[PDB]
Amino acid sequence: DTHAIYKVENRHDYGTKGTKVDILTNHILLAVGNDVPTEKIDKELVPKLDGWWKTAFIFTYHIDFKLSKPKKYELIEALLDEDEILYKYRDRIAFNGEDTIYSHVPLEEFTLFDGCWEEMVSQITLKFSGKVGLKDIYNDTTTQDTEVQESRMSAIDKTCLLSLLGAKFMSTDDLIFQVQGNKFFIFNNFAKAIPFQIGGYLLQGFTVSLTHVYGGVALNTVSVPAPFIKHTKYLPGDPRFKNNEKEQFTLMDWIIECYHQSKAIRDIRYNPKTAPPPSVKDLNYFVEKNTDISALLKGLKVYRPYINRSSKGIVGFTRESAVSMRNTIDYFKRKYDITLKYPDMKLVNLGGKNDVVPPECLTIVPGQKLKGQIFDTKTYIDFSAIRPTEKFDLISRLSMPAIKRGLTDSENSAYQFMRVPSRILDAPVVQFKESTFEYKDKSYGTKHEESKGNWNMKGHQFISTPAKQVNLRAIFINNANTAPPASMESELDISMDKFASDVKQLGVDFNVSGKPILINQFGPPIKPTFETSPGEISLLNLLENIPSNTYILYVLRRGNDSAVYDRLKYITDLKFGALNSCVVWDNFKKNSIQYNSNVVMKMNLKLLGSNHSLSIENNKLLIDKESNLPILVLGSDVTHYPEKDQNSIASLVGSYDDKFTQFPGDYMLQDGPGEEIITNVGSLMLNRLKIYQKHNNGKLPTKIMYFRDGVSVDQFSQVVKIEVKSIKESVRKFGPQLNGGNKYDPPVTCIATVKRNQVRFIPIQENAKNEKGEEVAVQSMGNVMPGTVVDRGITSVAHFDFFIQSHQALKGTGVPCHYWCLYDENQSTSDYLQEICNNLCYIFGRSTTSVKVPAPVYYADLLCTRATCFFKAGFELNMAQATVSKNVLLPQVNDNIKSVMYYI
RNA sequence: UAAAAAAA
């Protein structure tokens, strides 16, 4: 007859439970929807902002080019900047930045594009693609149709308005950088910037996007960090900058810096403040054979200040000096009146024909991205780890000027952060073996708040631990070009013994009385033809002659060896299916009982144990009452591009008991690059069921929750229409062949989590009354108290969505997870869903904390991450040994561990 | 690769 209809779920209620407090969010209300009756919101609370963005018709033009966005984008501003006629309209014309161009005015009124439908203008083709009324943005803001609201969220008018706001932001007399189309960095004396790695600084910018809320339209702003190449003597803030922002800083001045910096971090106690300045013989070898700066110069765009907005980039470094060039110093001394201070320095060339100039007089064009991998992660991370009070100021102080400039017509109580209501849910009860941890609310006075969703294992034991003493065997992977100190054998024997003794107190009996085994030269296959290295050769031997009941503890000499870790896991997990944990020597050797205690936590899980769970009452609400059979909780993630241009990897994990303590799973190569919809996710449902029925006397789950991670909004329709349908259709098929031939169609709810978003919260109060009148803390570490639930004011018009911030934000300003129930066959109220979401954040079994997203999702991410090591590990080989089959790129794991959390 | 958290 007719196919069935997988429609995205409409919101049906709001939650009620929890301690109430208002909080602020980084949103501004632009407008109240047109379909909201004037007799609804006070005339004073409606934002006094009108303008073009409310009531305008925008010309749009499709536009082809002749490829890198760098060139196109650069191409457009060039026209917009090198023509005194168009320049006047440069706050009214915007790039998409590949397909279209938006303009407040028509482009056919320009004596420029005559024959596009002066020389550079020939790489563009214009085609008027209609007009866009911007005022329809403010239309269906009450409409309770999840399909309409979808088409509204990812709409042309929304993209137009956003992109035209960018135009306004960009038209200021201040120096301003556009990065990836929507991130703007302003480089004035008030900017937040620190020197970064080599020849670079970090800079705090901002970005805006607009989100539809119920009746109607909000603007969201958040700060963004980016690295750039240093183009100034001094960085903003420094008082030597306020005086001369334009104090001479040539290309040479930059290379010296990079020299000092490079050696000061590749050698220690180098100290540039003492170290003798390079006498130019060093400094020529450097700038040619040293990738720490060659890669940066390769392409670096420079200025020629001695010719009196055209930056020639570079090609490389010549061989001839500034003196041995016939003369150059004579040219510049006579014909430009300048004395070359480093005339022995090799010169650079800026392409043909013969346009060659010395670095000593060649300034660097601002705003250039600092290409490379971040290696100084600590600096990068600390730069952005700002607490909410400090971070909301920053957002306000970078955004508001630009936004005010944007929202006024091309010739202040409204610009303030939305205040929304929140509710703080109680933490569940954490269960250990014979003990509990329930946070009891208390006043903000002492630092008591900091313990909600943040305990430790002290005076506690794991719930379930291996029955038998098990054999723990050290293998010292010696991933270094030098043999380890003599005092390491003794140091490790010490460490192993203490480790075995500490974890006994948690309930884990290890027999550590083996003898540690050293493996030098371990590493990935190497050269087309590769042959296995030692001591992979050594290790392999070791692994196929491994005793029973043996847990491998890999002690890495140097941490951070991506290539080594991937292999150790590839060989031990995938090939051999042997239980193993890695540990980094310089940590392990400190012998912290806290370090050791966080390590067994993983090991225990791997040995099928259980560390902490929820209380007996808490678990009751993930149990179907109708069958006294727990719910099958699934998590799935998708990671993209494991290498170069390769197929994405999907994973699915699932619970199997009523304790929700263990989540094995399976992973799978997608059949395309950057494919986010797991089109055949149902095939992975087969093991979820088989191990479920194993731990439930042969019965199949009667309810199913599917937590789907990492989808954007445009994909919600397909998650429901393709993935949920696939799950449903699959269990309907696998069901019968598992329960004795009977009909199987359990109801599934599906909740997508988006844990990376642009929504932030700042607390307003230190305390708030609970329902008994007792004043009680509602913030911890200067962030909103975990878990503040927010489902009003900034949530969608029609979808069943809510924010919950489940974790203590130990650093910076925490990021709440945005949950959307996309599909629901078991009539779940918001109070129900919000509680199990928050609750599931307390049974992440490798940390003593509540985490920022339900355990199933974190587990699914970790599994995707591990599948990526397997992929990456055996890949160079699979490019040689060869398009390639799925199970040779990403093989299945050994059957031994198909039902363990080897990814933990 | 002890761990949660903050940045991409």
Interatomic CA distance for residues A358 and A353, integer angstroms: 16
Which technique?
Answer: X-ray
Interatomic CA distance for residues A594 and A588, integer angstroms: 11
Contact A867, A859 (CB under 8 A): no
Spatial distance from the CA of A532 to the C1' of B2 (Å): 31
Q: Is the CB of A381 under 7 A from strand B?
A: yes
What tokens does A19 get? 């301690």
Q: Residue A194 carries which DSSP code?
A: E
Interatomic CA distance for residues A268 and A251, integer angstroms: 26
Q: Which residues contact A294 (CB under 8 A, 6 or more apart)?
A: A287, A288
Q: Is the CB of A565 under 7 A from strand B?
A: yes
Q: Where is A381: in which H helix or E strand? A: helix A377-384
Beta strands in A488-641 (DSSP E): 510-511, 517-520, 550-556, 580-584, 613-614, 623-624, 629-630, 632-639
Spatial distance from the CA of A323 to the C1' of B7 (Å): 47
Spatial distance from the CA of A815 to the C1' of B6 (Å): 9
Nucleotides of B under 7 A from a protein CB: 1-8
Contact A719, A647 (CB under 8 A): no
Interatomic CA distance for residues A288 and A298, integer angstroms: 10
Of the candidates A406, A425, A424, A416, the residue with the CA atom closest to the CA atom of residue A25: A416
B3 nearest neighbour residue (CA to C1'): A847
Q: What angle do CA A162, A163, A167 make, to 5 degrees?
A: 115
Subset of residues 844-863 in chain A with CB less than 7 angstroms from any atom in strand B:
844, 846-849, 851-853
Point out which residues pair with A302 in neighbouring strands: A312, A364
Question: Nearest nucleotide (C1') to the CA of residue A383?
Answer: B7
Q: Is the CB of A561 under 7 A from strand B?
A: yes
What tokens does A898 get? 């198909």
Subset of residues 602-641 in chain A with CB less than 7 angstroms from any atom in strand B:
602
Question: Nearest nucleotide (C1') to the CA of residue A580?
Answer: B1
Subset of residues 195-224 in chain A with CB less than 7 angstroms from any atom in strand B:
224
3-state secondary structure of A58: strand
Residues A334-349 as b or e (16 or more Cβ within 10 Å = b): eeeeeebebbebbbbe
Q: Is the CB of A596 under 7 A from strand B?
A: no
Contact A100, A61 (CB under 8 A): yes
Kindly tell me the sign of the dihedral angle through the C-alpha atoms of A286, A290, A292, A295: positive
Q: Is the CB of A394 under 7 A from strand B?
A: no
Return the half-sphere exposure (C-beta side, CA atoms, 13 A cut-off) of residue A372: 22
Spatial distance from the CA of A582 to the C1' of B3 (Å): 14
Cis previous bond, A353, omega within 30? yes
Q: Is the CB of A479 under 7 A from strand B?
A: no
Return the half-sphere exposure (C-beta side, CA atoms, 13 A cut-off) of residue A635: 29
Question: Nearest nucleotide (C1') to the CA of residue A814?
Answer: B6
What tokens does A550 get? 């043996």
Diameter of chain A measured on Cα atoms: 97
Chain-centre distance for alpha carbon A435: 36
Q: Is the CB of A451 under 7 A from strand B?
A: no
Question: Nearest nucleotide (C1') to the CA of residue A222?
Answer: B7
Subset of residues 42-101 in chain A with CB less than 7 angstroms from any atom in strand B:
none
Specify the number of domains making up chain A.
1
Q: Is the CB of A423 under 7 A from strand B?
A: no
Of the candidates A658, A661, A665, A707, the residue with the CA atom closest to the CA atom of residue A686: A665
Q: Specify the amino acid at residue A375.
A: F
C-alpha dist (Å) from residue A798 to A8, A215, A792, A819, A836: 10, 11, 12, 13, 22
Structural domain that includes position A345: 1-904
Interatomic CA distance for residues A885 and A214, integer angstroms: 48
Interatomic CA distance for residues A432 and A854, integer angstroms: 19
Chain-centre distance for alpha carbon A564: 24
Spatial distance from the CA of A844 to the C1' of B5 (Å): 14
Of the candidates A309, A28, A367, the residue with the CA atom closest to the CA atom of residue A185: A367
3-state secondary structure of A812: coil
Q: Which residues contact A885 (CB under 8 A, 6 or more apart)?
A: none
Spatial distance from the CA of A813 to the C1' of B4 (Å): 15
Subset of residues 540-559 in chain A with CB less than 7 angstroms from any atom in strand B:
556, 559
C-alpha dist (Å) from residue A168 to A88, A104, A224, A403, A416: 12, 12, 19, 8, 20
What tokens does A556 get? 């890495």
Q: Is the CB of A592 under 7 A from strand B?
A: yes
Q: Where is A157: in which H helix or E strand? A: helix A156-170
Q: Is the CB of A502 under 7 A from strand B?
A: no
Of the candidates A463, A576, A476, A483, the residue with the CA atom closest to the CA atom of residue A519: A476
Alpha-carbon dihedral A77, A80, A82, A88, rounded to 10 degrees = -140
Question: Nearest nucleotide (C1') to the CA of residue A815?
Answer: B6
Q: Is the CB of A563 under 7 A from strand B?
A: no
Chain-centre distance for alpha carbon A106: 40
Spatial distance from the CA of A338 to the C1' of B6 (Å): 49
Interatomic CA distance for residues A299 and A903, integer angstroms: 41
Chain-centre distance for alpha carbon A273: 37
Question: Nearest nucleotide (C1') to the CA of residue A378?
Answer: B7
Q: What values do phi and psi take at A611, rounded to 5? A: -95, -75
Kindly tell me the sign of the dihedral angle through the C-alpha atoms of A354, A359, A360, A366: positive
Q: Is the CB of A377 under 7 A from strand B?
A: yes
Question: Nearest nucleotide (C1') to the CA of residue A225?
Answer: B7
Spatial distance from the CA of A364 to the C1' of B4 (Å): 42
Interatomic CA distance for residues A854 and A756, integer angstroms: 14
What tokens does A842 get? 């307390």
Q: Is the CB of A384 under 7 A from strand B?
A: yes
Q: Is the CB of A646 under 7 A from strand B?
A: no
